[PDB]
Amino acid sequence: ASLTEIEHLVQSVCKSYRETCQLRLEDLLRQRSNIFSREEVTGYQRKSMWEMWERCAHHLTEAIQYVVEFAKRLSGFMELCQNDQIVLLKAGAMEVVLVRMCRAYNADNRTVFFEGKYGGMELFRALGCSELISSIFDFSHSLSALHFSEDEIALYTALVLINAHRPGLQEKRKVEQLQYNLELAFHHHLCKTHRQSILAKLPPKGKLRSLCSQHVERLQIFQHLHPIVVQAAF
Numbered sequence: 001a002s003l004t005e006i007e008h009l010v011q012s013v014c015k016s017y018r019e020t021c022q023l024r025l026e027d028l029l030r031q032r033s034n035i036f037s038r039e040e041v042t043g044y045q046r047k048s049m050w051e052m053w054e055r056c057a058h059h060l061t062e063a064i065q066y067v068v069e070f071a072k073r074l075s076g077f078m079e080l081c082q083n084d085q086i087v088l089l090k091a092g093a094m095e096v097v098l099v100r101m102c103r104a105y106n107a108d109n110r111t112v113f114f115e116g117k118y119g120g121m122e123l124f125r126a127l128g129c130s131e132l133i134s135s136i137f138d139f140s141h142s143l144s145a146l147h148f149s150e151d152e153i154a155l156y157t158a159l160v161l162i163n164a165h166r167p168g169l170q171e172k173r174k175v176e177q178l179q180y181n182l183e184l185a186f187h188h189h190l191c192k193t194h195r196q197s198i199l200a201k202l203p204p205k206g207k208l209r210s211l212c213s214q215h216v217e218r219l220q221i222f223q224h225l226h227p228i229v230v231q232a233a234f
């Protein structure tokens with residue numbers, strides 16, 4: 001690939017993210033002043049773990065839908081065989097959701113955008129998963145310290161997904177090629193934006209995997225007893 005082709009890949013990935021980011025950064029930022037009152041938090045805390053599960057399940061399913069859409073728009077992804085598209089998304093879609101969450105997180109007061117307002121970790125008390133919730137908040141806080149641009153998120157999350165080391169890939173070489181081109185795109189763009197400094201500050205690949213594993217385990221326990229049907233966005 002040439003520098004023009006690399007730059008075209010950059011622009012393409014960034015457009016794909018802009019179109020599938022689900023919530024606009026501008027809207028997330030403007031709504032930071034909109035925070036759940038004490039009585040609203042109490043209202044959430046009083047809800048059954050089952051109600052909080054179905055609400056959270058709905059929001060997670062929706063978020064995954066947008067991540068899948070993002071993948072489908074990535075140059076080359078649709079050219080991979082069906083098995084490999086599934087392997088990559090099965091392994092990475094929830095990891096991308098966790099990265100995307102940092103945009104909806106306010107480090108100033110440790111709150112997250114949830115059902116239209118910002119709330120702290122105590123909003124989720126009824127789940128009885130305080131360790132997991134706290135880890136998700138800590139992770140988001142770590143990422144917010146980097147002041148990720150929209151385009152850095154676009155390129156970083158593309159690379160979360162396009163990982164040739166995922167077990168079960170039938171065309172590993174094709175995935176390797178896509179991953180390498182995306183690494184070129186990411187590194188080239190960091191250079192063009194004087195943002196080289198962020199690479200060393202990104203969380204180790206193992207940190208995101210570890211958090212996602214803990215997350216999924218908790219999700220499986222809820223979804224096993226309480227499945228839910230969710231709207232899709234074509």
Ligand SMILES: CC(=O)N1CCN(c2ccc(CN(CC(C)C)S(=O)(=O)Cc3ccccc3)cc2)CC1
Nearest residue numbers: 022023056059060063100104112113114136218219
């Ligand atoms: C793209 C974007 O900016 N957004 C806005 C953020 N949104 C979103 C927001 C909150 C949740 C709730 N949980 C995240 C923790 C911070 C508590 S949770 O569902 O992960 C909590 C949970 C629930 C059940 C079991 C384990 C953990 C899920 C999705 C996604 C879409």
